Amino acid sequence: EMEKEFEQIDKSGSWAAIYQDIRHEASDFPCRVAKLPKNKNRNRYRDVSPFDHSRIKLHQEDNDYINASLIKMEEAQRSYILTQGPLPNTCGHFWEMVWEQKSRGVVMLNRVMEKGSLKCAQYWPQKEEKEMIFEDTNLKLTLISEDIKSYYTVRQLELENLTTQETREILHFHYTTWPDFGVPESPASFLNFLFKVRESGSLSGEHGPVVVHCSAGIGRSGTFCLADTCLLLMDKRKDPSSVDIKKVLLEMRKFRMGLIQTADQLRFSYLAVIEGAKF
Ligand SMILES: O=C(O)C(=O)Nc1sc2c(c1C(=O)O)CCNC2
Ligand SMILES: [Cl-]
Ligand SMILES: [Cl-]
Ligand SMILES: [Cl-]
Ligand SMILES: [Cl-]
């Protein structure tokens, strides 16, 4: 059914039109805090900001601001934190957010450098013996091991709250092969990656929401959460073809602006959901 709706859109070549309808219908809510002068250097892209109502608030006695949004999908009973790739001055805030929100997993969908340009700070240690200390938020981050596969890498990170000496294991799920232009021709690798994140337990309700990011935290990040939520809805509903991907994306856009950044990303999400539903 959705597979037939996909074919109809492909035949009529109307992906651009449907995507623009989503942009026109998208929620608009204030982003006052993100736009305060003191937060100028906490935002990677001036045109991508968290809404006030859903932004993640830092708990320590400093500026509470981070460019991060809580997406809470009520029917699917799943939550995500979507955030930008951290800046050199916000890596401490990023790990403070992971700690305070009790996240177990971080999903990274970009490379630190892409097409020769820097899209994200090097916010985790590449070498076991060169741990990272975030003196502003009093956290220590250590690479314990990594499992490098051909299209993604899973890292075992140890995050220590230097104030309490408590430690936690954070799983770093890094999709390293998103193409330089456009979307993956096939959703096979992306779905395998999603299933690996699921199997880890990082998306379960037992701990805090997974933290998902790309460079701006809206395009690739939006594809990941949209596909995941739509697949959940298809398992839950009596008539799984009743899942309206466009409605689900508009619901998610109540929580963060600009989720899905191109018509190709929209088509890719449809294709991922169609293929993943088959399993
Ligand atoms: O990596 C991503 O998918 C992502 O959300 N990218 C985005 S969204 C977005 C930009 C970018 C960028 O990477 O330059 C530039 C400014 N406008 C919005
Ligand atoms: Cl200010
Ligand atoms: Cl990288
Ligand atoms: Cl950077
Ligand atoms: Cl948009």
Descriptive account of the structure:
- The PDB classes it as hydrolase.
- Keywords: protein tyrosine phosphatase, hydrolase.
- The protein has helices at 2-12, 15-25, 91-101, 188-199, 220-236, 245-252, 263-278, and strands at residues 55-57, 65-73, 78-83, 105-108, 113-114, 117-118, 132-134, 139-148, 152-161, 167-175, 210-213.
- It is α/β, with parallel strands linked by helices.
- The chain has one domain (1-279).
- The strands form two sheets. It has a nine-stranded mixed sheet with strand order 1-2-3-11-4-10-9-8-7, sandwiched between helices. A two-stranded antiparallel sheet has the order 5-6.
- A hairpin with a 3-residue loop joins strand 8 (139-148) and strand 9.
- The longest helix is centred in the last third of the chain and has 17 residues, at 220-236.
- The chain starts with a helix and ends with a helix.
- The structure holds the ligand O=C(O)C(=O)Nc1sc2c(c1C(=O)O)CCNC2 and chloride ion (4 copies).
- The site of one chloride ion has 4 residues, from loops.
